[model samples]
Structure formats: structure tokens, C-alpha cells
Target: MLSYEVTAEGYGGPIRLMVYVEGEEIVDIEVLEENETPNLGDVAIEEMITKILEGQSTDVDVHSGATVSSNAVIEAVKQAMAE
Candidate 1:
């Protein structure tokens, strides 16, 4: 397994994260820094994390309420994957 840093902008500000990849699948993800509305963004991120981990792809659905935040993660992961 391997991990990398992801820093992307969100609705409120910047989102920082660490992505752990194990054989093309995401074994874990850590939210190092997050910027967005409280419950709304946080809740939506959990859903996206679940989807991302299970699918092992950034094609996961964007969170309805937290589109920017969700997309931030997607972009970050995709960038990390490309690297």
C-alpha cells in the first residue's frame, strides 16, 4: 500500500487529504484539512468517501449539497492516481 497528499480547494476554502492506495483500491483516506460548511459538507464527504473507496474510482456521484467539496476530493484523488 502507498499514500499521497491531496490539496484542493473546496466550497469554503482548501481541502487537504491523504489517500492510501492498495493495489488500485483505496485502503484508507485521511482528512488532514477541510474547508466547507459544517454538517452539510462533512456529511456529504462521508458519503463520497464510501463511494470512492468501494468503487476505486473518482467517477462516484457528486454530493448533492456539497458538490464542490465532493468534487474537490474527486479531483484530488484523480490527481493522486495520475501521479
Candidate 2:
């Protein structure tokens, strides 16, 4: 397994996480830090991770009202593999 420590900007993201991957598949994610509001940015992030792990893809659709946070999560994942 391989992991990457990455950061992105937004509410749900702009947070930090250690994303572990097995080849091209995401194994798991370890959230290092986040300060987004619960039921708001926090909810966006939760759904983001849920979809990512379920689909094993960061190309999932964005949150209806939490677009910025959604993108942040996707960007973080892409960056996780970019390096």
C-alpha cells in the first residue's frame, strides 16, 4: 500500500488527509485535520468520502449545495495520486 499526505482548499477540504492506495485502488483515508462546520461542510466531506470509497473514483458528482467542498475532496484525491 502507498499513502500520500495532501492538502486542498475549500470548506470540506482545505483539510488534510493521508490517502492510502493499493495500486490504482484507494484503500482507505486517514483524516489528519479538518475544521468545516457540521451538517454543512462536514456533511459534504462525509458524502464525498463515501462515494469515493464506494466508486473508487474521485470523478464523482459534486454536492448539490456544497460544490466547493466537493471539489476540494476530489482535488485532494487527485493530488494524492499526482505525486
Candidate 3:
């Protein structure tokens, strides 16, 4: 397994995301840290995680009201994959 640390700006502040990939497959994801809204931006974390687990791709749908946070998570995952 390989781990990557990616940081991006969410709706409120920086979002620190950790991604675990095993031989080209995404094995896990974790929100290391974030300053997004209590329940709004945070929801993007679980949403993205579920999508990634279902499909090894980061091409995920965004949350309706959490666009910024959702984009941040997607961008972080894309960046991690690129790296």
C-alpha cells in the first residue's frame, strides 16, 4: 500500500486528506484535518470516500450545497493520483 498526503482549500479553510492506494487501487481515504463547516463541508468527506470505494476513480459527483468542499476532496484525490 502507498499513502499520499494532499492539502487543498475547502469552503472554510485548508483540508488535509490522506489517501491509501494499493497497486493502482484506492484502498482507503481519510480526512486528516479540515476546518470546513460542522456538517456541511464535512459531509463531502464521507460522500467522496463512498464513491471512491465503489469506483477506484476520483471522478465523483459533487455535493449540492457543499460544492467547495466537494471540489477540494476531488482535487486532492486527483492530485494524489497524479503524484
Candidate 4:
């Protein structure tokens, strides 16, 4: 699976995700977008980032009320894991 980590602003994606294989061992990573949110999915982003970094894609979940943004972030994570 793929996971990722976001970099500073203007660095492409604020999601910041990474990818892994069989739920462990990072194999790939990428950036999706930027200037997302500091509330809704922002905090969730940190959780997902750690989940991805820890090679735990399945464990990541989209934050409630922030479906769209959260889904986008998760999609990035999914992409990293896909490779």
C-alpha cells in the first residue's frame, strides 16, 4: 500500500503521504496538493501521515464532516501504496 508525508507550503501537496507493501516497509511516496486545511482534515492528515509512515494504510480513516478533503488525502495515501 502507499503512504505519504506533506512538505512545507508551495511544495505541491500538503497531504504528505507515503507508500508501503503488505502494511509495512515503505516503498514509495508522493505529494498531492497544498493549502488544504488546519482544522477539518488537517489534524487528520497528521494521523494519516503517521499511519502511512508506519506502513498502516488500512488503519487510516477519513475524518468525519471533512469527507471530501479527507478522501483526497486518503487517495494520495492510496496512490503511494498502490505502487
Per-candidate TM-score against the hidden true structure = 0.91, 0.89, 0.92, 0.50
Question: Model 2 over residues 2-67: C-alpha lDDT tens digits?
Answer: 878978888643688789988888888767877776788778888888899899988899878888
TM-score winner, 1 or 3: 3
lDDT of 2 at 5: 90
Residue clash pairs of candidate 1: none
Per-residue lDDT value at 37 in model 3: 92
Instruction: Point out the higher-scoring one by TM-score: 2 or 3.
Output: 3
Cα RMSD for candidates in order: 1.1, 1.6, 1.0, 6.0
Model 2 local distance difference test score: 0.82
List ranges where model 4 is wrong by over 4 Å.
Answer: 1-24, 27-33, 53-55
Candidate 3, clashing residue pairs? none
lDDT per residue for candidate 4 within 1-83, as digits (tens), equals 43345333311244444344555555544444455665655665555556666655545665666665566666665555555
Looking at candidate 2, the ten consecutive residues that score lowest on lDDT are 9-18
Model 1, C-alpha of 20: deviation from truth (Å): 0.5
Number of colliding residue pairs in model 2: 1
Off by over 4 Å in 2: none
What TM-score does candidate 2 get on C-alpha atoms?
0.89
Model 1 — TM-score against the truth?
0.91
